[PDB]
Amino acid sequence: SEITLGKYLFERLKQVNVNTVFGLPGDFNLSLLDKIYEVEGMRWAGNANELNAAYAADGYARIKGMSCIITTFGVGELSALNGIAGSYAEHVGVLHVVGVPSISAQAKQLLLHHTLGNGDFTVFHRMSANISETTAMITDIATAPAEIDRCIRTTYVTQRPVYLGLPANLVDLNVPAKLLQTPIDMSLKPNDAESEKEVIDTILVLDKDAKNPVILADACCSRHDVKAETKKLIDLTQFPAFVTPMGKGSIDEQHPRYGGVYVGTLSKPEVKEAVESADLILSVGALLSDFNTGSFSYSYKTKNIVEFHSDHMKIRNATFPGVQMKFVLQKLLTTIADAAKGYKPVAVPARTPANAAVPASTPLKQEWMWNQLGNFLQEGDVVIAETGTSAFGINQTTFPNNTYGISQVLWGSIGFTTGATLGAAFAAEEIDPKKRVILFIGDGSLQLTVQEISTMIRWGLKPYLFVLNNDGYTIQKLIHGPKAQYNEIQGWDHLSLLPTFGAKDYETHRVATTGEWDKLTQDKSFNDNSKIRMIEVMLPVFDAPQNLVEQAKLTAATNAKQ
Amino acid sequence: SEITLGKYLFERLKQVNVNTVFGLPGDFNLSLLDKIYEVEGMRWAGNANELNAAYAADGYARIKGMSCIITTFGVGELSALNGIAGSYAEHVGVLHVVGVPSISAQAKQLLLHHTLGNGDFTVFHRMSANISETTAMITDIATAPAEIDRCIRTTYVTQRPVYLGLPANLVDLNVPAKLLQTPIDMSLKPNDAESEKEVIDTILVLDKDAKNPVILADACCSRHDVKAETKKLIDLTQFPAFVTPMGKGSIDEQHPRYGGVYVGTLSKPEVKEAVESADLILSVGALLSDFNTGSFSYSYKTKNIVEFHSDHMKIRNATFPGVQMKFVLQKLLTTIADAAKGYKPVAVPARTPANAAVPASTPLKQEWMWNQLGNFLQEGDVVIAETGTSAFGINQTTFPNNTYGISQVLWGSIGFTTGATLGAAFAAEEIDPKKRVILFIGDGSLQLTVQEISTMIRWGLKPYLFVLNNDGYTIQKLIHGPKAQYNEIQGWDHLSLLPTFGAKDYETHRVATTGEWDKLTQDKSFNDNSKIRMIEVMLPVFDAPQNLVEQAKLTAATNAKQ
Numbered sequence A, B: 001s002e003i004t005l006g007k008y009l010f011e012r013l014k015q016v017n018v019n020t021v022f023g024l025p026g027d028f029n030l031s032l033l034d035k036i037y038e039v040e041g042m043r044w045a046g047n048a049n050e051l052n053a054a055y056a057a058d059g060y061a062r063i064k065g066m067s068c069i070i071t072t073f074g075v076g077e078l079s080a081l082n083g084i085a086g087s088y089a090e091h092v093g094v095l096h097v098v099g100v101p102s103i104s105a106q107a108k109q110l111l112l113h114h115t116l117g118n119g120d121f122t123v124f125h126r127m128s129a130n131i132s133e134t135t136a137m138i139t140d141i142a143t144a145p146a147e148i149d150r151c152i153r154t155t156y157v158t159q160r161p162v163y164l165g166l167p168a169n170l171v172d173l174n175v176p177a178k179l180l181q182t183p184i185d186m187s188l189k190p191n192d193a194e195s196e197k198e199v200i201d202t203i204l205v206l207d208k209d210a211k212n213p214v215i216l217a218d219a220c221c222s223r224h225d226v227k228a229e230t231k232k233l234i235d236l237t238q239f240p241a242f243v244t245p246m247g248k249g250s251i252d253e254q255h256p257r258y259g260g261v262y263v264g265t266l267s268k269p270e271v272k273e274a275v276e277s278a279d280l281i282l283s284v285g286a287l288l289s290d291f292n293t294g295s296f297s298y299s300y301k302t303k304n305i306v307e308f309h310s311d312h313m314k315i316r317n318a319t320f321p322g323v324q325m326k327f328v329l330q331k332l333l334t335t336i337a338d339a340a341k342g343y344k345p346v347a348v349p350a351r352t353p354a355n356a357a358v359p360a361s362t363p364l365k366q367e368w369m370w371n372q373l374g375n376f377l378q379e380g381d382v383v384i385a386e387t388g389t390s391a392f393g394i395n396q397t398t399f400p401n402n403t404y405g406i407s408q409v410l411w412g413s414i415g416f417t418t419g420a421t422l423g424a425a426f427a428a429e430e431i432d433p434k435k436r437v438i439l440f441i442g443d444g445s446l447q448l449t450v451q452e453i454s455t456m457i458r459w460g461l462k463p464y465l466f467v468l469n470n471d472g473y474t475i476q477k478l479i480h481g482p483k484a485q486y487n488e489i490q491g492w493d494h495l496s497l498l499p500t501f502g503a504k505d506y507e508t509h510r511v512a513t514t515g516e517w518d519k520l521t522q523d524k525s526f527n528d529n530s531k532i533r534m535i536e537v538m539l540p541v542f543d544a545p546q547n548l549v550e551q552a553k554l555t556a557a558t559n560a561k562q
């Protein structure tokens, strides 16, 4: 008949397919955490710090749909904020629950630990409101279940973080269990019928008239859950389809009509030409950040641009506020095959040639490696690349179909990927134990978040941790200060990290040549995700993908400009 | 004739005795960081993450006077905020400089990396304003030197964090070098003459009448720079002097008139009675947090309480807003000996007896260890204790004279002390390379910030890192959930951390018995700060100082109260 408010939270999370909860304990959340163990199929990660926990919640949300992190008042929540902010920037639905002091402690303005010593229990909530879609600070048991449901709905449908403050005393108060028998509404509201109809009809007419239409899939294609619709759009139209760095993985790269990665002036020449020659651009989920675009270098020759967005549409100069692309895309599928019936297929650019055979002893280089990496990948992989040479290089890697890419192109917080790897691995394990999680992280970035490897070990998760050892911050050495001491790092014994954190079942490997790379990555044993692995990749100090070399120049000039 | 704005910053920091600068590089601060190397006697720490950098700037400011951390826009600054908030809470003067996008980038609202993708370049500044005494976002080269000076002054005189945003383009613009020839004013403004005179006259008359007066030194005695005055006060009056947990170290514990650590009902019975029987209490810098006071358990019998504060005075129920204790204390010293001439010295509580001799095989226990630790400490030591059993236990340790204690009793952010140890060690090195820095940190807390040991190694700093291995979060097990899985941690090979982070010159040790403790800590070579050392201390899971046992129960009740 009745259930505690705390247990209610976890029953709801279970209902929306959140089965791992991230964060760290503190006195203000201990009673809440007890309730996780009362709900079958729910687990507590036990993270090594709160920033890493937030990065992990982000990775989990990307793979699973949404996530939850629980921290403690003041010290826990503020530690998480850079993780939360990146989830806001990149449209990832993370529910941040904070255990806060009891209603009686607040009213008395007790001078408690984890406060600023000034009796203000609102300050941290106010800070988080700047990087949250919405917030709730629970004060009343009577409306608490509805507020929890609102927070969960909002997280999922907006794909932005939400803040939920839960006083320690209130988590043990009873609420009606029958509320759980009615699901949370997790669907978008329908579009205005007339605006949506106008949008669809206009697009259909533009399509019918187009001789060289192209589809360009970007970040929000993935973040706002229109990958299936976009796949169908590609199939029904047969139009050339391109992807951006931030959207990579959102469309299938083995599809015959896939044309490559468009990055404005930093694209391969054949890709730049094929996109920019279009007489109609169907742009799905654009997010035109500097690193996503070669510092805003798009040069479309057409004005016939259709922008699909989560919350609005644009066609040429016409804006349609509130018209959500999810339903526009779904409804377009009804008639688009007929609209596109007269289309004579335009050729798409060929895939970059495979690497030529070279002696085994050939030292490893970045360009070779990213072009070779496609041999190792398999359908279903999660492929995560850290800001630095890795994020820029992965753009040159060809993915199998059904590859989930994670690259934080906009927020760009180094260290993100160690935590994101943990969260992605938990989610992948829940979906299919055979799904591999593959990380490319720099030696510099690893240092910021290295302890989260501990949490991977404790749960027996089996990611591939490729660490690019180029003796420091190479991306920055190219931007400014190639020999500057601030671009150098203390040298760690990377392969000792796993046993130092208590790993028992693991493998470590070092690769420095093309022969060593191929021998390891082609090995059948290595390709089974049977245990956690670290692979230290030895690369030259100043070696970087050519797109990064060019971006670095642009970024340096942007910052130095008067 | 002219100096870049960036170089001006570092010349000013040098003038105010800030010689190590904390933080991490990013494109928005690289040109600024170049300027550190242009000023002799300035160094860049090269931290392993920004949170740890902020914790280190806090430890450095505690020992040296103030500090500076430099981060990059968005991702760097938000990572630091829990460090900054702890510095705000505990009154530590940390200057947080953020490299921000160029003026032209901001004006054009470029969709740059490390933004929320909404064109708002003010959001992180607004967030930091909640935990800063003041802020500055530089936009104008003409007033930039004055703004830098204002931020530096405010950091020092208020001992709170200050936020200073520096656009990347402006750091390379020239300012007049002659401005450096006039020092920044680092002094307090005089008190209101009439108010201060009333306060001094009243205190003096209370003194003359007191038969059992006592001095109680608390957090702000140390934080607001009245240790010297307090020492004089103790000497001129001969009144019994007691200290709080948060103020421990602020008064010399080998002074004949030192009476012990007062923590309300959690004090030794002799100490409680000695303080509470007073007919006058001279309270220097009170900060009455839960952990500092046994949950607000002070039971003063007298109404004759004089509260000295940085920014005001209180005498009985009378408040004197704006009357700063620094000048009150200085001026009191002129007449206090005369006022106290009739005082017949009251006995002070005796020191806790030394541990009884026991056989070498006796397992280590917390109560024994904290009592024994006094044998190892020497004058000039910096002694740092992490939130957890360490912070509670260090209260039971007797300090030599001139010992600097660091315990973050109010903010209580676990992990703080790894960073604080780094910062304290840099500062200690600058003051006197013979000063030892001694850290007691729990196994749980170490996990949050472990990578900062790397930065200690890279600079050849030589702290003693005592790690209390009690297999998890013992403090929390005593509050709630003694066997709860959230209070358990992944087991690390602690002694392998130093070599994993590239240490070459170091020692590691394990102690589990009284014999092993005494053999190690009495050893002559061990007592020399010749190299970095880690000591893993094996302690029982449920063993804790008695004051923590009681505090845990009070805290659990406070949170669970309806």
Ligand SMILES: Cc1ncc(C[n+]2csc(CCOP(=O)(O)OP(=O)(O)O)c2C)c(N)n1
Residues within 6 Å of the ligand: A386, A387, A388, A389, A390, A412, A413, A414, A415, A441, A442, A443, A444, A445, A446, A468, A470, A472, A473, A474, A475, A476, B024, B025, B026, B027, B050, B072, B075, B076, B079
């Ligand atoms: C939290 C945070 N701090 C600082 C930066 C600035 N930054 C961007 S890339 C980078 C260096 C990455 O170095 P590494 O991981 O070694 O990559 P690589 O050498 O392969 O380029 C830094 C410090 C950042 N992006 N995020």
Ligand SMILES: Cc1ncc(C[n+]2csc(CCOP(=O)(O)OP(=O)(O)O)c2C)c(N)n1
Residues within 6 Å of the ligand: A024, A025, A026, A027, A050, A072, A075, A076, A079, B386, B387, B388, B389, B390, B412, B413, B414, B415, B441, B442, B443, B444, B445, B446, B468, B470, B472, B473, B474, B475, B476
């Ligand atoms: C950043 C942060 N996260 C969580 C907490 C809550 N907390 C307080 S004490 C503690 C456990 C400390 O454990 P450990 O360092 O092993 O100390 P000990 O076992 O000696 O008590 C935790 C998790 C905190 N204070 N700060």
Ligand SMILES: [Mg+2]
Residues within 6 Å of the ligand: A442, A443, A444, A468, A469, A470, A471, A472, A473, A474
């Ligand atoms: Mg590197």
Ligand SMILES: [Mg+2]
Residues within 6 Å of the ligand: B442, B443, B444, B468, B469, B470, B471, B472, B473, B474
């Ligand atoms: Mg412990």
